[PDB]
Amino acid sequence: QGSITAGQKVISKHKNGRFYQCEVVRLTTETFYEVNFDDGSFSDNLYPEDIVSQDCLQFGPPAEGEVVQVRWTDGQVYGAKFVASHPIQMYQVEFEDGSQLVVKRDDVYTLDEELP
């Protein structure tokens, strides 16, 4: 939703799990990758760097259906096939303590609106 802009005071969840006032420092795009692992399990939230069979950061996303190897969150490598890439509008926010998160549109609230 286009209603949130850089420099806006908003309310979002700090890393401590509670809602505080923070400030949007930057609007950014994060590209997510979707793959089918060789066992048929599906992942929708890989980062391009997690493809270890080719350099997607340099050359962009694989061809749909292309065989890939994936470094998973457990440090391990797995066979898979590339499905699709999805760019996502993210909001980099800073709290009064100076901590920063990069959160989705649904994770931020204006000062006028009821939580949650």
Residue 79 burial by CB count (10 A; 0-12/13-18/19+): exposed, middle or buried?
Answer: middle
* Token digits of residue 49: 């760097």
CB 18 within 8 A of CB 32: no
Q: Are residues 41 and 81 in the same domain?
A: yes
**Alpha carbon distance, N-terminus to C-terminus of the chain:** 17
CA distances from 33 to 2, 4, 5, 41, 58 (A): 23, 25, 26, 14, 15
Domain count, the chain: 2
Q: What are phi and psi of 16, to 5 degrees?
A: -80, 0
Tell me how far apart the alpha carbons of residues 43 and 34 are, in angstroms, rounded to a whole number.
5
Fill in the amino acid letter for 84: A
Q: Are residues 95 and 110 in the same domain?
A: yes
Q: Are residues 5 and 40 in the same domain?
A: no
Q: Are residues 12 and 58 in the same domain?
A: no
Which own/partner pairs from 49-55 qualify as long-range (CB within 8 Å, at least 24 positions apart)?
51/82, 52/77
* Token digits of residue 37: 């692992």
- DSSP state at residue 58: H
Strands in the chain per DSSP E: 9-13, 19-37, 42-46, 67-71, 77-95, 100-103
Q: Are residues 99 and 77 in the same domain?
A: no
Tell me how far apart the alpha carbons of residues 25 and 91 are, in angstroms, rounded to a whole number.
8
- The experimental resolution of this structure, in angstroms, equals 2.2
Residues in Cβ contact with 111 at an 8 Å cutoff, skipping those fewer than 6 apart: 9, 10, 11, 21
Positive or negative, the CA dihedral 24, 34, 60, 87 is: negative
What range does the domain containing 103 cover? 1-31+87-116
State the method. X-ray
Q: Are residues 68 and 102 in the same domain?
A: no
Q: Are residues 57 and 68 in the same domain?
A: yes
Q: Are residues 58 and 71 in the same domain?
A: yes
CB 66 within 8 A of CB 115: no
CB 93 within 8 A of CB 10: yes
Tell me how far apart the alpha carbons of residues 109 and 8 are, in angstroms, rounded to a whole number.
11
Q: Are residues 18 and 43 in the same domain?
A: no
